[PDB]
Amino acid sequence: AYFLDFDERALKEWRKLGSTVREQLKKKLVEVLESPRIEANKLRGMPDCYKIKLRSSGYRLVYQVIDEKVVVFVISVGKAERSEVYSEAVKRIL
Incomplete structure (x- = not known):
């Protein structure tokens, strides 16, 4: 199993x-x-x-899998409408 972590903005x-x-x-x-x-x-x-x-x-x-840290990194939680949740995820990874 993997550990869990959140982006600060994703946890909010x-x-x-x-x-x-x-x-x-x-x-x-x-x-x-x-x-x-x-x-x-x-x-x-x-x-x-x-x-x-x-x-x-x-x-x-949306989450990123990070094998080197054995972690599931939650980067974005929000609405699919207008791809909001997805554009934010890309933005926060860059």
Whole structure:
């Protein structure tokens, strides 16, 4: 299993999340820690990035897998609408 870390800005997003949505993402995030490279969820663009999707929120969590630190690094949590959550993730990695 992998350890967990958050970007400072991503952790704030996490705590601002509504209760029901956070719990939904939390269950999936905990599953992710057991084995975080889930090829179906791999994001295009820079390597080692994956998403967690909800069927109808439509909130998203973006994380980077960092093997050298055995860590899942949460970089962005927010809305898929207008690709907000994804553009922020790229911005925070650069």
